[PDB]
Structure 1
Amino acid sequence: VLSPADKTNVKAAWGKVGAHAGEYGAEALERMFLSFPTTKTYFPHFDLSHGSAQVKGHGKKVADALTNAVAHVDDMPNALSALSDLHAHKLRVDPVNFKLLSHCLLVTLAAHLPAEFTPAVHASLDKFLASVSTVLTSKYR
């Protein structure tokens, strides 16, 4: 559960992402695919090569979903229900995977926003991502 401070931190940092959103999203996926190769299993029909346009496109989708979550922070389940359906009901993604992507996103943010990635913001971002993961792995409809 996020503190008001958490929400503020998240809005501030995610805000600084801006139009890089998608790039950051694609980099996080590539980091995931290389570091934890088992995750590729969920993308049987993707071109997971290095400058893959498929991954770039997907990265943008992921990044947009996070922007959506930020702009509905106080009522995530309602805003992300379609994503829960996909991830939880249709794909049946093992929750462990969410920890891997969350980690890869944190790594990406650290590598790009050195001044913003303070311990306090790192803490809020981790908590936020765990919140999002919980929604996407639950069947609540």
Structure 2
Amino acid sequence: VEWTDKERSIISDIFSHMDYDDIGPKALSRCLVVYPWTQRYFSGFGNLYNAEGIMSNANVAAHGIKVLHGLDRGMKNMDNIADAYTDLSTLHSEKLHVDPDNFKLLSDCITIVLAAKMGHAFTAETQGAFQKFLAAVVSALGKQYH
């Protein structure tokens, strides 16, 4: 949508210091237990049976890191995020058949994990900028569903 310079810098900061290797596994892990229905999409991933099992599941660590990177295009073309997700939207709908509501659930986990990591740095102004960015990306992910 329309971005203020502040949001641009806030978004720029967060990604600059993001430990994709730490946030990604933990954000995807937290999603799989907090919203167990999301497990269906990861049939071959192995142990998704309880908290422990998800928490130490290699398939999930690696994929979370991946999921988080998927955002990278967005903040890298902040004025063209919808178009930037044309393909993934198509991938997610027609190839993977993923209920886009999960986009919002995982977005929320990502937000909750970034907050644990950033602590006091996760100010209200930072939460707003991050959620705004994520909502925009979520909209873009479910564009191609028809």
TM-score range normalised by the length of the shorter chain: 0.7 to 0.9
Counterpart position of 2:9: 8
How far did 1:98 drift? 1.3
Counterpart position of 1:51: 56
CA 32–45 in structure 1, closer or farther in 2 if over 3 Å, else same: same
Cα pair 1:26 1:57 within 8 Å, conserved = yes
**TM-score of the pair, normalised by structure 2:** 0.85
> Structure 1 counterpart of 2:80, which letter?
D
Cα pair 2:82 2:136 within 8 Å, conserved = no
Q: Which has the higher contact order (CA 8 A, sep 6+)?
A: 1
> Structure 1 counterpart of 2:21, which letter?
G
How far did 1:120 drift? 0.6
> Structure 2 counterpart of 1:98, which letter?
F
How far did 1:132 drift? 0.5
Unaligned segments of structure 2, at least 5 residues: none
Structure 1 residue ranges, 4+ long, deviating more than 3 angstroms after superposition: none
Counterpart position of 1:32: 31
> Structure 2 counterpart of 1:23, which letter?
D
Correspondence for 1:111 among 94, 97, 116: 116
Tell me, in whole angstroms, the C-alpha distance in 2 between the residues paired with 1:81 and 1:66.
Answer: 13
Unaligned segments of structure 1, at least 5 residues: none
Are residues 1:88 and 2:67 paired? Answer: no
RMSD: 1.7
Identity of aligned residues (%): 35
> Structure 2 counterpart of 1:77, which letter?
A
Counterpart position of 1:132: 137
Tell me, in whole angstroms, the C-alpha distance in 2 between the residues paired with 1:52 and 1:94.
Answer: 23
Cα pair 2:2 2:79 within 8 Å, conserved = no
Count of residues paired in the alignment:
138
How far did 1:2 drift? 4.4
Q: Deviations over 1:54-97 (max 9, x none)?
A: 11110121121122221121212333222111112222322321
Cα pair 2:83 2:140 within 8 Å, conserved = no
- Of the structure 1 ranges 131-140 and 105-114, higher mean CA displacement relative to structure 2 is found in 131-140
Cα pair 2:82 2:139 within 8 Å, conserved = no
